Amino acid sequence: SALNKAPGYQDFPAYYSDSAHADDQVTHPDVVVLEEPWNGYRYWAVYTPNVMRISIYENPSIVASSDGVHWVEPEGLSNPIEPQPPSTRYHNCDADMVYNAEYDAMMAYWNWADDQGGGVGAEVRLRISYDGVHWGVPVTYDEMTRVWSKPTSDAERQVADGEDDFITAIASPDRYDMLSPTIVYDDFRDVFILWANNTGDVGYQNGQANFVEMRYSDDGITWGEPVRVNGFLGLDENGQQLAPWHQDVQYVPDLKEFVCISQCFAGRNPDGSVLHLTTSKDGVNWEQVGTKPLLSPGPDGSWDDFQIYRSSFYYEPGSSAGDGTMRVWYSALQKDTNNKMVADSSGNLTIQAKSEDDRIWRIGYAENSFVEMMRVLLDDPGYTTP
Ligand SMILES: [Ca+2]
Numbered sequence: 001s002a003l004n005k006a007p008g009y010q011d012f013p014a015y016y017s018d019s020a021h022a023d024d025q026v027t028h029p030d031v032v033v034l035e036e037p038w039n040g041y042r043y044w045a046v047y048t049p050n051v052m053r054i055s056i057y058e059n060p061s062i063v064a065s066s067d068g069v070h071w072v073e074p075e076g077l078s079n080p081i082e083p084q085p086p087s088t089r090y091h092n093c094d095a096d097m098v099y100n101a102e103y104d105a106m107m108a109y110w111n112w113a114d115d116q117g118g119g120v121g122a123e124v125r126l127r128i129s130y131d132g133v134h135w136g137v138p139v140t141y142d143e144m145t146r147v148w149s150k151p152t153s154d155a156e157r158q159v160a161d162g163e164d165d166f167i168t169a170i171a172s173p174d175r176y177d178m179l180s181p182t183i184v185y186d187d188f189r190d191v192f193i194l195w196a197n198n199t200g201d202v203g204y205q206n207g208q209a210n211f212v213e214m215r216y217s218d219d220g221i222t223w224g225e226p227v228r229v230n231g232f233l234g235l236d237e238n239g240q241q242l243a244p245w246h247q248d249v250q251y252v253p254d255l256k257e258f259v260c261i262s263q264c265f266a267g268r269n270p271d272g273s274v275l276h277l278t279t280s281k282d283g284v285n286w287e288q289v290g291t292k293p294l295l296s297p298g299p300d301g302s303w304d305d306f307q308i309y310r311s312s313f314y315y316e317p318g319s320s321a322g323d324g325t326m327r328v329w330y331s332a333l334q335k336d337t338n339n340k341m342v343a344d345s346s347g348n349l350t351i352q353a354k355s356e357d358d359r360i361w362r363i364g365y366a367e368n369s370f371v372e373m374m375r376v377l378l379d380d381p382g383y384t385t386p
Pocket residue numbers: 030031096097182183248249312
């Protein structure tokens with residue numbers, strides 16, 4: 001296997017309570033792994049609850065962990081960090097979080113859409129936190145200039161975290177042309193980069209017309225015009241072109257390159273989607289690693305048997321150069337679940353999926369040596385990093 005899946009899945013809490021849906025359904029994690037604890041924890045994750053049929057619960061939420069497995073809500077935090085929208089006309093989606101070393105703060109992004117045709121379109125929005133508990137607009141951010149001034153005291157390391165206290169990073173008049181924003185600070189060029197998938201005003205059925213665009217920003221707040229990436233995905237094992245759906249990017253210092261796990265597909269839409277790996281020296285020009293999928297749906301009846309969904313990763317360096325560990329928090333869905341018994345996070349059959357649970361949404365984990373993973377992807381039993 002390119003990655004070894006851990007049995008069961010990880011317990012993320014979801015705030016919603018809805019009789020027609022099983023509890024604690026979640027998707028689209030984004031994990032930050034730090035060298036030293038930030039507000040008590042080395043691992044921080046943003047994620048969204050989600051269920052079939054209604055998207056109103058799909059609101060950025062935060063947890064933290066000492067091990068990347070057992071997640072908790074930090075004391076004093078109340079999820080979600082961005083409120084439930086006032087009606088089903090709107091929904092949130094696609095959270096991604098970065099640690100800003102210069103400000104010692106986390107920056108959590110997400111996508112907000114007006115789903116109504118001929119509506120106002122969508123935005124990528126942003127909440128920042130100093131303390132891990134309060135997520136919003138820094139008190140030293142000036143909304144008139146869009147400058148985040150560095151705090152000069154501990155008392156200036158605060159935010160406003162009310163319902164309206166977010167920054168609009170990007171706006172578009174189309175609904176679905178900035179899906180799954182993923183952000184990295186490029187410490188060579190000294191610029192923030194955001195990649196997103198442009199599905200126009202169409203979305204899930206746009207299919208092979210989809211393409212990834214990148215944008216640049218000096219601060220992570222105000223962004224330039226998009227340009228298309230090149231070579232993002234290649235051919236699968238049948239020689240069929242893959243299209244992007246959702247993605248996560250990291251710069252990996254040990255490999256001297258950007259690395260992306262892409263949730264992608266070869267047919268008309270992301271049903272049955274898989275993960276593929278793709279790399280780049282510059283963030284612009286990519287090359288898929290091999291033809292084989294990094295991760296695929298499990299066997300019929302497993303919690304990940306319909307599709308692999310957006311996934312987040314950390315390359316954990318080893319004691320020698322080029323010999324790290326790929327740690328992957330993957331979301332996925334199980335098909336055909338209405339009224340069916342499904343697994344709990346320990347892999348035991350204790351959860352009754354409900355009437356309107358057409359599918360079940362969960363977050364799990366997979367891992368491998370980077371070298372072993374590359375050997376599988378490349379069909380090269382002797383691959384080692386250069
Ligand atoms: Ca990320």
